[PDB]
Design a protein around this ligand. Structure first.
Ligand code: NI
Length: 341
């Protein structure tokens, strides 16, 4: 049965609610982004209207084989009508195609559903500023003060400098980047751009990237592994064993690997500045763990919510345990007392 946190009250709308079969009373199913926990249940067998961004629609058609008749793409930053209700999709600063949805209810209530997001100050100067938002459905992935991380830009600058140095020292070194879903494409795109290369990958991953509306993409990526000095592999294969095996496959064209593992947070974010990062090394393979997040830090989340001043918050992440719900409720009350709403 569909949870209350996936229903928009006073409409027949749901958000990210595809794993429950037919939801009784639902006339329009929104999909915030193409991550499998959110699209779970969608397939060529789905026959109700799905509303989403253009990029998400491209993925639904080509990767999941959802029939075109049921895909309803909407543009961003544009007031649209769906089933007699005014809605706006906003960029979520998550993965490609990911949106937040603003619902303008017939009774006059305004609801923001963030989907998955990485809060940013630029959101305080969007259409959200034009009116009061009463209810917030919030991505609470990192809703605890220990979760700090660097900016995306600091992480990219580190990755670019690291790769340029290693390949200038050894022109026969290969760079490898791990991946398992869409998101975090700037890691590999920026390293390839500094090295004057295309990015090589599997046919399945190339197909995915060709759905993302990236300008000039044919100049940036290829399925010809041989021609390229930045390669993508599944995250699972970024270990000494998998990287040695891969080096064997390339026809001795490279004698060394430098690899990146973009992660979420792990325990050592608590001490180590990006400049201090050092890799794990075994012989001619070195691997760097880099904390590249597409979710809000605690401080980013707190800033956004204290700016928005919602009357009610409904979390969408870590809601399966009481302990987690209680802890989140405590932070929400702190933030409200501090900021005066
Ligand atoms: Ni996501």
């Amino acid at each position: 049965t569909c949870p209350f946190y996936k229903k928009i009250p006073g409409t027949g709308f749901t958000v990210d609610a595809f794993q429950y079969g037919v939801v009784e009373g639902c006339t329009a199913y929104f999909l915030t982004h193409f991550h499998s926990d959110h699209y779970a249940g969608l397939s060529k067998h789905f026959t109700f209207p799905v509303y989403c961004s253009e990029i998400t629609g491209n993925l639904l058609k080509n990767k999941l084989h959802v029939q075109e008749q049921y895909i309803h793409p909407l543009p961003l930053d544009t007031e649209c009508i769906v089933n007699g209700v005014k809605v706006v999709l906003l960029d979520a600063n998550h993965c490609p195609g990911a949106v937040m949805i603003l619902f303008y209810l017939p009774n006059g209530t305004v609801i923001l559903h963030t989907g998955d997001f990485r809060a940013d100050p630029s959101m305080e100067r969007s259409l959200l500023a034009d009116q009061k938002v009463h209810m917030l459905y919030l991505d609470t992935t990192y809703c605890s003060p220990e979760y700090t991380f660097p900016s995306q830009q600091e992480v990219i600058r580190f990755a670019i400098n690291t790769a340029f140095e290693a390949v200038t020292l050894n022109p026969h070194a290969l760079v490898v980047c791990g991946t398992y879903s869409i998101g975090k494409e700037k890691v590999f795109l920026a390293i390839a751009d500094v090295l004057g290369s295309k990015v090589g990958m599997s046919q399945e991953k190339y197909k995915t990237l060709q759905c993302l509306n990236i300008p000039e993409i044919n100049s940036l990526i290829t399925t010809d592994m041989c021609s390229s000095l930045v390669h993508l592999l599944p995250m699972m294969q970024i270990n000494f064993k998998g990287l040695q095996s891969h080096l064997k496959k390339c026809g001795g064209k490279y004698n060394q690997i430098l690899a990146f593992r973009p992660t979420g947070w792990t325990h050592s974010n608590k001490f180590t500045r990006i400049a201090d990062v050092i890799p794990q090394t075994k012989g001619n393979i070195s691997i760097y763990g880099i904390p590249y997040s597409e979710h809000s830090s605690y401080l980013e989340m707190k800033r956004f919510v204290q700016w928005l001043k919602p009357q009610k918050i409904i979390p969408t992440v870590n809601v399966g345990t009481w302990k987690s719900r209680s802890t989140m409720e405590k932070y929400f009350r702190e933030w409200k007392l501090e900021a005066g709403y």
